[PDB]
Write a structure and sequence with these properties.
Structural class of chain D: little secondary structure
Number of strands of chain C: 3
Chains: A mainly beta (114), B mainly beta (209), C alpha+beta (120), D little secondary structure (56), E mainly beta (122)
Largest sheet of chain C: 3 strands, antiparallel
Largest sheet of chain D: 2 strands, antiparallel
Radius of gyration of chain C: 15 Å
Radius of gyration of chain D: 22 Å
Distance between the termini of chain C: 45 Å
Family (chain C): Belongs to the bacterial ribosomal protein bL17 family.
Number of domains of chain D: 1
Number of helices of chain C: 4
Function (chain C): Requires L15 for assembly into the 50S subunit.
Oligomer: part of a larger assembly
Distance between the termini of chain D: 59 Å
Helix content of chain C: 25-40%
Shape of chain D: rod-shaped
Strand order of the largest sheet of chain C: 1-3-2
Subunit structure (chain C): Part of the 50S ribosomal subunit. Contacts protein L32.
GO molecular function (chain C): structural constituent of ribosome
Largest interface: A-E, 14 and 13 residues
Pfam family, one (chain C): Ribosomal_L17
Order of helices and strands of chain D: HEE
Helix content of chain D: 10-25%
Chain lengths: 114, 209, 120, 56, 122
RNA sequence: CGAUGUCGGCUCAUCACAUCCUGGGGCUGAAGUAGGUCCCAAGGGUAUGGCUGUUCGCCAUUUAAAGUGGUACGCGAGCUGGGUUUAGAACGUCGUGAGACAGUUCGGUCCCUAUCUGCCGUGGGCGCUGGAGAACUGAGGGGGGCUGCUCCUAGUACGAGAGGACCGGAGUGGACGCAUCACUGGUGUUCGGGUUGUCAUGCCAAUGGCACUGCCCGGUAGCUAAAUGCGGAAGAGAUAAGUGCUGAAAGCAUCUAAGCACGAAACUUGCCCCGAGAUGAGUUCUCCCUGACCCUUUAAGGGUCCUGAAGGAACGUUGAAGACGACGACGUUGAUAGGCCGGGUGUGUAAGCGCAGCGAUGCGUUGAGCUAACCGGUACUAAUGAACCGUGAGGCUUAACCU
RNA sequence: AAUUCCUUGUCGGGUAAGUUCCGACCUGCACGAAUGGCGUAAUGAUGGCCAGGCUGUCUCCACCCGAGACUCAGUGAAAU
RNA sequence: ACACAGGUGGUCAGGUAGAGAAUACCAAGGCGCUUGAGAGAACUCGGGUGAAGGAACUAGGCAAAAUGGUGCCGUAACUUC
RNA sequence: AGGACCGAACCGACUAAUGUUGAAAAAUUAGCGGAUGACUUGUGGCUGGGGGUGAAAGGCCAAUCAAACCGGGAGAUAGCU
């Protein structure tokens, strides 16, 4: 039994939704600039499942035109503002990382309604 | 300088809006209750012993039990002796407080490294090995040659071969204190400190930063 | 090097040791006492205490587990059927280990492992 | 292969430095069985310290 | 990593079709280069249209890399391939006019406003 | 020549200094900037490719710097065999020929079961003078020392001017090594899933073997690094080189002679890791032993009873301790290793059930089902005692206390 | 040139840079017309050379796992 | 020469996929391989997996890795056609 | 149809590894080179040492060859160790 959980309490965010891969959330950040701190969003699809509470690296694939670009967001960081579920996907795998090398007919995601 | 005995319990990172993670090593400090202060006759130098928790004393032999009897047979992880320059401190129950690490940020930490068993002939020196393609006999993972033919006829003491690595008594002297709590005995220091979960650590104020 | 890997490796290649201990677990529930070497006996607790805990419950589709490890009717007519009520009151405690000295003229350490409800 | 000379008589003594390995003192008695047992091993009647370790 | 014999595409206007890294040098045993750090490059397939030619050595910087970028808040950003930009040898700046593909903030330390002014969202 | 194996390739040293770089002084055909040169200094650090067997050399380029010699021109019980130097065959060469090539080429062999001196680690022992259990010192021993660019000092000094710098402060990196698992990757047969072929459990579901760990994809626990991070300092003592005053021999002059003050990346320290085999064992704390008889004046030795300490070796549950030993925890004065209970867990919606569709198959039950390694709880399972090894106040001498 | 000593001959092409490679020379001290000279395709376990595919060959090596190393009990060597 | 990493004249041969004395799993049928037991250490003998870059290595892509089936669409220089 | 290509039997060795006090004075593994032919193989016969046999190597002729194996001349000969 270990005090890392008592040190989780003072870092862990509570305003956080439930997510799975293929979900869309629109991630917001202050671009890490320490001066004027402009807010910017990033659009993409989740390719992450976090497994635990505070150990959430939150990987997203940008997609944009239909394929490309990968980023980790660390959504419990003070450099990150918010996420809110825009649509949900459907998965039969943990983090669904094959979306880096498959498209379309082979990676449809769907919504499943279940 | 006084030394405070404690235990490594893991790592976290402290977080910032600045864009720096600041990894911290998480330490639980002992109640360093004090059981001896030297001088007022004998030794000629001023030094202190802390006593570090309790052990089963049912158990414990008389040569150690007569050395704890002034404070009861607790002892725990050991006594740990350190010099304390010109301080007028009393010999029992003086209970040295960790709260100094809120005023001083520079600290020196001693502990033990990774338990590796074998040390490794390469991994103690990290020397480049001989080629593994097209041959090599029994020697793909050794730190080159330990000597040469034909005149020397010996291998010298001080040659970079074999040695001992892992479970070593190791010091770090570039630490910066991020938090201390005297009631919870909780200490946070910037960066990685040698050892693993449950490893014993000793902290003292540093002389430079 | 054992950095933190719990318990034993146990002797023999995985490919034999697995088949052997799955066979010998059948032999253990069949005869309710086994004689073998001390390391083998101390490792015959491993995944077998959980298998007694598993053969005790009556919950749905529990028969999917160990299904390829028990196929003979002379033990399949007892497991999942009447073994459970014999090993349910003792908070585990299904078996004891015992050292049985050495072999005659030979220095291999022997042991005995017994199931606590053995009455036949 | 090489050897400089035949080894000294001290060299077996320098290997075999321990005598009998232990105190080798006499075996333990128990009132459950008519024969002596070793330290922590079981009696012929299936007992240890007066408790039945094994049935027969 | 971007090191000796690494093959790249050009992320700049009317460049060469294939350009090869020949040296990183400058060490103190320099191994590889990150994005925005100088390397020496050769032309292997050019499509000569009045700017580039085969059999020529010049200096360049990497702008996109499959290995991506690191630095702030323990974060990592990764891309799908390797792309370079070739630099003038005595008069500063890239030899063309533009930058292709997603770009990165790691290139914001460049000494001239054109390349840090962006239609790309980074 | 009664065997001391060659060239190139390469992992690995160490000594010398006719010193490559820094450290310090002097001169210049040295205005500044930048070079040339000399003596004085050894600490670290001292680069990559084309052709070639290449050492090399030529060609193509870095760095603060990429110096030179010695060590059987260090390095086949070290590896490699391209080169050299035969067994086949040929071009050029030499002979009538047998045959030959300091010309070329296709090709080609590389043996080692530690006895002992050597070194690294890991135990058992001996010594401090009775024994046990230890600490603090430091006689000594090892490790390190190397470095860029840029800004500010400063377009200030130098210098008509143009060009164009100290000390000093700061910014930002490269290599090198070491330590971590919060971060980021790889790996991960003890686990979850997708799947083809076949076989099997009587049969069919279902579940599972075999086919590279059958393939394909994930991963707790663990390992490690590319990921994360940090540093050789500052101060002090003596002293060369070198800066100097005072001042003789030599009424002058002279840093040396007397006198007085300085000073190196080397030396002594510091710093860090070991350290009293420092037999020079220093000094100190805790624990324990406070027995004697017989024999011969016998102070020189012997035997024997009475009686056993502090502690040690041993049996075990075994580990974050591991080569075995050892070290460490725990043995009911019980969480040491497991089960079990309560869980953490990664995976990704089970099996049975039902319904729809000509069926394949899909859908609802189904945030389903299943788990090792991590954690607390719970004695549910397990963890003898004698005996043994070790004592009984321990050589001399002076002042003293008590007797 | 499987021939050129001196020859990396000298030069174009191939690379950033090419003793080799590709195409020449006419200078074969010394090829040469059945001791044949001249030449091409499938093709050869044929020497060299250029590129891609794939790649721990290399950069910097990491993790995983049988059998041995280790320790036993039996049998138990030898060159020296 | 051996209770020997091997050899020896004649002979047979079913599913399932396939033309299969190919390759996979099995039938009929045999065998669990002639010291055994602890251990589970770096390392060696040998397998499997690998970020990002790729032949930069090396005398030599040497080795390793990948490629690998059938039919149809399609297919050059050179050629003794 | 096939001195074609695939490929098991069979035949044969390009590379890497193992083995040369090794299981063995030629055997082993993994990728294999060939495989109705100038093929390969079971069996017997014929050819003999200054002679055989050889798409012909001082190769092969039973571990052996610029004359093998065995015996005799033989107690060869040695201005030498």
């Amino acid at each position: 039994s270990n005090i890392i959980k008592q040190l989780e309490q003072e870092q862990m965010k509570q305003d956080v939704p439930s997510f799975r891969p293929g979900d869309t959330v629109e991630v917001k950040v202050w671009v890490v600039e320490g001066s004027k701190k402009r807010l910017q969003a990033f659009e993409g699809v989740v390719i992450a499942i976090r497994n635990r509470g505070l150990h959430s690296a939150f990987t997203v694939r940008k997609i944009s035109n239909g394929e490309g670009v990968e980023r980790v967001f660390q959504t419990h960081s003070p450099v990150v503002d918010s996420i809110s579920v825009k649509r949900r996907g459907a998965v039969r795998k943990a983090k669904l990382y094959y979306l880096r090398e498959r498209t379309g007919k082979a990676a449809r995601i769907k919504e499943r309604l279940n | 300088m006084i030394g405070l005995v404690g235990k490594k319990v893991g790592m976290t990172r402290i977080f910032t809006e600045d864009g720096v993670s600041i990894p911290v090593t998480v330490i639980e400090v002992e109640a360093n209750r004090v059981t001896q202060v030297k001088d007022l006759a004998n030794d000629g130098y001023r030094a202190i012993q802390v006593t570090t928790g309790a052990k089963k004393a049912n158990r414990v032999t008389k040569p150690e039990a007569g050395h704890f009897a002034k404070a009861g047979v607790e002892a725990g992880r050991g006594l740990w002796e350190f010099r304390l320059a010109e301080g007028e401190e009393f010999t029992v129950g003086q209970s040295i407080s960790v709260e100094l690490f809120a005023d001083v940020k520079k600290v020196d930490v001693t502990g033990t490294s990774k338990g590796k068993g074998f040390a490794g002939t390469v991994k103690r020196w990290n020397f480049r090995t001989q080629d593994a393609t097209h041959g090599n006999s029994l020697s793909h993972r050794v730190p080159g040659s330990i000597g040469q033919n034909q005149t020397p006829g010996k291998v010298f003491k001080g040659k970079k071969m074999a040695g001992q690595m892992g479970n070593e008594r190791v010091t770090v002297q570039s630490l910066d204190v991020v938090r201390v709590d005297a009631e919870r005995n909780l200490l946070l220091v910037k960066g990685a400190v040698p050892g693993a979960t449950g490893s014993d650590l000793i902290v003292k104020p540093a002389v430079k930063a | 090097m054992r950095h933190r890997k719990s318990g034993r490796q146990l002797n023999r290649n995985s490919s034999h040791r697995q088949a052997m201990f799955r066979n010998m677990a059948g032999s253990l529930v069949r005869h309710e006492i086994i004689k073998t070497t001390l390391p083998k006996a101390k490792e015959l607790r491993r995944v077998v205490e959980p298998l007694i805990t598993l053969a005790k419950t009556d919950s749905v589709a529990n028969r999917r587990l160990a299904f390829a490890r028990t196929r003979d009717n002379e033990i399949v007519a007892k497991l999942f059927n009447e073994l459970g009520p014999r090993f349910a009151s003792r908070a585990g405690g299904y078996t004891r280990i015992l050292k049985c000295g050495f072999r005659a003229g030979d220095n291999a350490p022997m042991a005995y492992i017994e199931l606590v409800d053995r009455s036949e | 292969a090489v050897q400089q000379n035949k080894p000294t008589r001290s060299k077996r003594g320098m290997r075999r430095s321990h005598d009998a390995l232990t105190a080798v003192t006499s075996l333990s008695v128990d009132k459950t069985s008519g024969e002596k047992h070793l330290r922590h091993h079981i009696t012929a009647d299936g007992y240890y310290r007066g408790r039945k370790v094994i049935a027969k | 990593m971007i090191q000796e014999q690494t093959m790249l595409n050009v992320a700049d206007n009317s460049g060469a079709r294939r350009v090869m890294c020949i040296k990183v040098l400058g060490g103190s045993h320099r191994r590889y280069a990150g994005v925005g750090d100088i390397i020496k490059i050769t032309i292997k397939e050019a499509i000569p249209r009045g700017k580039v030619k085969k059999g020529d050595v010049l200096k360049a910087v990497v702008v996109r890399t499959k290995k991506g970028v690191r630095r702030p808040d323990g974060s990592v950003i990764r891309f799908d391939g390797n792309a370079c930009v070739l630099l003038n040898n005595n008069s500063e700046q890239p030899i063309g006019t533009r930058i292709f593909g997603p770009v990165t903030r790691e290139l914001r330390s460049e000494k001239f406003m054109k390349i840090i002014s962006l239609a790309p969202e980074v």
